[PDB]
Amino acid sequence: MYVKLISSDGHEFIVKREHALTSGTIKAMLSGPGNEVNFREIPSHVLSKVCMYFTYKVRYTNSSTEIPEFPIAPEIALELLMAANFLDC
Amino acid sequence: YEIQRERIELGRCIGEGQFGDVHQGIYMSPENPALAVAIKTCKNCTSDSVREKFLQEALTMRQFDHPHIVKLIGVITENPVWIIMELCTLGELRSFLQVRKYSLDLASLILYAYQLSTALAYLESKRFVHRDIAARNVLVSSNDCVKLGDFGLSRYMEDKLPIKWMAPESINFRRFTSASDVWMFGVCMWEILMHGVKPFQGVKNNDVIGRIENGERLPMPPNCPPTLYSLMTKCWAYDPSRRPRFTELKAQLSTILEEEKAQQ
Amino acid sequence: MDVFLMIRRHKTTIFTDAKESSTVFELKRIVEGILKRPPDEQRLYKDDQLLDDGKTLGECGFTSQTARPQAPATVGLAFRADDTFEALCIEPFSSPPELPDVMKP
Amino acid sequence: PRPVLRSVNSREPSQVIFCNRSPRVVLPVWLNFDGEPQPYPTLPPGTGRRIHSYRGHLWLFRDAGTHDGLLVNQTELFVPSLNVDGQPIFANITLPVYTLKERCLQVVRSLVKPENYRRLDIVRSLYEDLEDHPNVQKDLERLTQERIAHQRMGD
């Protein structure tokens, strides 16, 4: 199963459910309702980078191989910190 | 000269001998302050058979008084029987040279060679042949001081006959002289400059003498002054009487040391 | 080798993996599973370059080095409109603010 | 009590290859017999090094510059064991997968002098997170707790 993550500026990010569940906030938003998540305060340049983090995390968690650095450009570092702090990942 | 066992605090075990384990420890005396000591211990307590041969190793070290040979501090004959030695607090040379591989200057490495040369010139003056000169048997008292370790604990533990340290005449004829000590010293100097790499890694003990006899020698260490490698080469003259005396090594090492201090 | 991709159409971005050795056509089968449009209704692009169905992703220049989990490569996607394909149109992501002074040398 | 995370004084030699498979300059840290951390010489990225340790010795690995945590053979602690067939023990040192938040804090820390954290336009909780630098003592506390807890699991 894939999930749709929608940024503040309307960008649709389709990612594997397993990848999205890396974030405890996304996990909490997908369990409670008795799938698609909207983020009014996270813009697309930040949410794209968060999705790259999900890919990275599932690929390299419990790998015996060498793992590369997760790169963060200086320009996005503050917004991405605030995103990670809110998303719990 | 006995010491009062109560003034000895037995510490952690720092090694093993033929006879028993060896421990670090402290010795506070009525005449001087707290002193770090090594305690050799003996498993057996046979009067003439084992207790004699073990107290003999203390007798041997009592003969020597040199700033670069571990001093005997005392013995305890009451059970269990223990020999008390000056502690070299920085432990074994090989481990020390690897730990400080990137932080030790060449001048210090040449100093260690110089100091060992002074102990070996001294041993020759006592008509005493060490037979077990190798980095494994050298101990570090401080950053600027190494010492030959216990003669008893030095035997055949260079790491069985230490073929890769031995002069050809020791391998071929079991001849053991000052001139054969000079060969071993050359190898020990190589060990020091190589930061405690053993000589002839990956070569079988049985093939060493054939390689020696073909004119093969340990190669010039990286960052070894040519004058020093030339001194080592002379120590490894096949013909014992073409080797320098410890006397000449002392003088030439002192000159190479000053030549290095004057450059850095 | 595994390759990590962003498949991008308008304001839509799919995050998916495939192999160097998978074909363009097999990537189109992955898009179909997600966006329910069959391969014959898709065009995939590397920049402006239309990709042939038979080429491997690796042959198109999507490699372990250019398509990483932490830095996926972009594949452009255009669907058939009526009897013709829409033009390749990818909306850029938003841009960050000016770098704060305390984050420069 | 006695520290739970300490080396045992075995004097059983063990040859080890510290392999820095990370892009960080790596500080090997030995826990002595009193469980105190001792720094060893740094390992540049991509460099292996044969080193002499002992069975039952405890090592951990850190970024030399920043003190960020590293894994060794996919875990936090490395314990040399018996050499077998004369085969040296590999210590594969890698980056962990840091949380996105921790990786973000590493990057802001590497760009902003600590005296300037308070000029950044973020909430106070993140100023405090920036100031809570990684350090070995904190990680030893944490690793001790996780070991004490683990040894108490089951009844």
Ligand SMILES: CNC(=O)c1ccccc1Nc1cc(Nc2ccc(N3CCN(CC(=O)N[C@H](C(=O)N4C[C@H](O)C[C@H]4C(=O)N[C@@H](C)c4ccc(-c5scnc5C)cc4)C(C)(C)C)CC3)cc2OC)ncc1C(F)(F)F
């Ligand atoms: C001729 N022989 C003898 O006489 C003799 C023989 C045997 C015994 C005693 C003798 N007599 C005397 C001994 C002494 N001193 C002395 C001699 C030896 C010891 N110990 C200490 C305990 N040791 C085991 C251990 O576990 N050692 C650690 C140790 O070695 N460790 C930690 C970890 O496991 C990595 C390993 C590392 O440090 N290894 C080195 C090689 C290393 C270097 C670099 C690296 C790295 S890491 C990144 N880059 C690099 C290059 C990694 C490891 C320690 C505590 C030293 C740090 C056995 C030897 C201590 C000593 O005094 C305090 N003084 C006087 C005497 C006297 F002669 F009786 F008077």
Ligand SMILES: [Ca+2]
């Ligand atoms: Ca329990």
